Design a protein around this ligand. Sequence first.
Ligand SMILES: Nc1ncnc2c1ncn2[C@@H]1O[C@H](COP(=O)(O)O)[C@@H](O)[C@H]1O
Ligand SMILES: Nc1ncnc2c1ncn2[C@@H]1O[C@H](COP(=O)(O)O)[C@@H](O)[C@H]1O
Lengths: 344, 344
Amino acid sequence: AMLIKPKRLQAGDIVATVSPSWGGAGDSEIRWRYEQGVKRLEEVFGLTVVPMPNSLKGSEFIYNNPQARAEDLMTAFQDTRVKAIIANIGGQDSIRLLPYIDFNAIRENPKIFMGYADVTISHLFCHKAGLSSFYGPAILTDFAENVEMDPYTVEMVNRTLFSNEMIGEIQPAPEWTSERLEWIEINKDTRRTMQQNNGYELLQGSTTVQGRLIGGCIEVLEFAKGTELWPEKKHWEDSILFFETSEDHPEPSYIKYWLRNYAAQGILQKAKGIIFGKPKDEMYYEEYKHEILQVMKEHNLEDLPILYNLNFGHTEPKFILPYGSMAEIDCENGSFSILESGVE
Amino acid sequence: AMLIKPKRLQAGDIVATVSPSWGGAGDSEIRWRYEQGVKRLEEVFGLTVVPMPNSLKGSEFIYNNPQARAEDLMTAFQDTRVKAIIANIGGQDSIRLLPYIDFNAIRENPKIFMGYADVTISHLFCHKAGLSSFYGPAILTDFAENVEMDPYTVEMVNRTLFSNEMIGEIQPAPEWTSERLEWIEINKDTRRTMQQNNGYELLQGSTTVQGRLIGGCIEVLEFAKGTELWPEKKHWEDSILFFETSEDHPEPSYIKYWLRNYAAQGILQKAKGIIFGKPKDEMYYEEYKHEILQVMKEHNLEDLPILYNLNFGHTEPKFILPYGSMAEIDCENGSFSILESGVE
Ligand SMILES: Nc1ncnc2c1ncn2[C@@H]1O[C@H](COP(=O)(O)O)[C@@H](O)[C@H]1O
Ligand SMILES: Nc1ncnc2c1ncn2[C@@H]1O[C@H](COP(=O)(O)O)[C@@H](O)[C@H]1O
């Protein structure tokens, strides 16, 4: 282990909400959605929520003030009352925060940080500071789910952030959705239609392997390549890579190119295994498979275990991936597990 | 200066053709196109052309044998009779040659190497070896133009590779084209339709600047980010960046993302200026300008000289960009110049 595992959460703890990417949470027509997400944090998990100063000032201000976003993060980390930090939503430009990050402030204040998509960049901030962050649900997409939170997501939050015992095997969700239901309050009493889930798919591999988790949104990780934010070499040794595709539905060819680059970096050659999240709307589901298996064939990595269609990324519900945690891919059973606690 | 400048070309010299990317040149229905290109090298420039052993074995073989492609390049460089090397065509997977390149062989054998698009990777082979290469025309796309080569392209070959005098100002071409005329022999007698060219556009900047050239195909450069092929930091200081978009017409959003990454690397903050090639078919011509100016605005670089719509990239005709050569953007006149010879 080379990342600090933060302290477990419990009822009464204060959680901070932040907008390091898109600042729509503060927009007039969206605010209701944010408040809905806060409600579940307070009622289902018994937590106290506090928005950081600049977090709800709207999308226009947020976009024009990357420094203000950084200040919000630093404030949350440097406040010892804050036991956890949760992103409101992803976006596309959180990379602009890099010049304003005091990594030492993160290093000196280990605590839970969670989010996904463009929040991958913020996870890399933590990662560089030697802090294990959590690739998981955000306020507006998961906690603010209309009518009721998904029991699957709730369970995984409990198991990951409220328990210092081994997470164990991650079962596949029974249902999933990526249906677009506009975030206007007129729809708050409307449930999203669910789709039956078929489970995980083993694309290749014939062995049981263990490695430490690293990765995120495959599109956003590209933003950090070549930068000082990219993880040091040792973080890629004996790893379990995890990738998920965003809502832009990246064309299959780009997956191929991006994976080719991971081979050019020597990353795929060091991996113990790889896991892929369900594509949003299951778009390019079969096409991505082709591109992935092709790259492995190109670099003689056809024995590398790859698990597909996992419940993380841009579909609901989702489980949580702690960065740096020991994970397992059992090819014989086609199962996936996390072999330790997410928190102390 | 850090890159070695190769010796000037002249009639009687031997030129090697290579397929470091797509191996179509050897394909039955394309071979004629290769031979037509060779014909111009012989008759227009008085050069002897020799294909490398694996360069014409077809697209299937070449795709499956990246090591064979590498060996072809090493052969050409290490053969002291070969005074120049020209890529047949681009592609998308020349990054796969990386583990098979002997950079020392390139170092000990300075000579002309030219091509564009996916050949950018091969330029980075030369670059890492400290050899100045030439972002310029290829066999199948330029030297094999039906009926006759564009005088503009011929002029730039002569001014860059046959003269050891200063290249000087690069005037814009009077006409341009990117019309898809199938490379089947039945079309050899058909000219491609030309479009009037309107000249360069200054997107921003108000001061004359000078710096050394570095860049290539913006999509292909992403393939090398994070790898040991990426040029060292010193090469990016006081440089003139040059980018051009490929035939796949990359969505404007990706131009923004990619340019955001250059800022995240600190490259844009080091540049003296930037030049962009005419997009293929002028697709996203206006859209790209918006994305470029947005990124400059995000990172407070609205004074950085940016010249737009130059005659290099995936349109014909072309001029040639020698890596590492001193170049100039004159904002007063909106002109572009290369302030030294391309060859010794
Ligand atoms: N105004 C909106 N109404 C409903 N859903 C939205 C809205 N804006 C964004 N979303 C969804 O929220 C997701 C957030 O993804 P990300 O920004 O990657 O975290 C998007 O992919 C959309 O599916
Ligand atoms: N069989 C073909 N017939 C006509 N044009 C082609 C053919 N194959 C490739 N091209 C063109 O050649 C260029 C290839 O780009 P690159 O591979 O980047 O050099 C593009 O402009 C293609 O449209």
